[PDB]
Each structure stands twice: as structure tokens, then as C-alpha cells.
Write a protein that binds this DNA or RNA. Sequence first.
DNA 1: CGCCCGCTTCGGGGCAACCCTGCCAGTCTAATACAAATCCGGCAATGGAGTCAAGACCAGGTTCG
Length: 49
Amino acid sequence: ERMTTQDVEAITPQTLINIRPVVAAIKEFFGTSQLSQFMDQNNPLSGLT
DNA sequence: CGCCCGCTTCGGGGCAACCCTGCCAGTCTAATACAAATCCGGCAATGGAGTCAAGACCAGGTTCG
């Protein structure tokens, strides 16, 4: 999107790349997903299992 | 000639147990300019509401003649 609206001979990948949707996807995977489960450690066997 | 209807299939809504147990989800042209409304801060009319000091006032329980 901003590869066009930005003026040429002025921009740089510091001004192009937005890391905020990237970091949000990782944080919404490790938080609040039904595979990012809470570590069930009431003994070493269930910790392993 | 074009005209219409009986089975077939395609789709579409409804339902599929019950106790506990858990707890808070997203993104960009950017500012001026002005006016009505609102609000809040400070004296300034209070007079009402409370507070004290003083006393007058009884009429009854306590003591002397």
C-alpha cells in the first residue's frame, strides 16, 4: 500500500516495514490459542506428557 | 407449431447430555478558527441555623426555729 503513496527517492525499509502486525500475530498465538496451552506441571510425568 | 406437468435432485434449517471449570478480545495527512456552552474560583448579598451566657422562673426534697 505505502509502496505507492510514499514519494520515491525519499523512502527506505525503515519507513516501509511495519512490525506492529507481525508482533501482534505472535502475541495472539502464544496468548489465547487452544494450542498454546497452559503448562500442566503437577508432577514431572505430566510435565513430560 | 409451442405447451405442462410428474419424479429427482439440490439445498437449507435444526439438533445432536449432563454435573464442575473457567474470568478482561484492534488501528493513521492534520490541523486552524470561532463561537456557544459550561464550568470553576472568588467576593458578596445574606438570614437561617446553631451556640452560649444569663437569668427569671417555678415548686418540690433538705434543713433550722
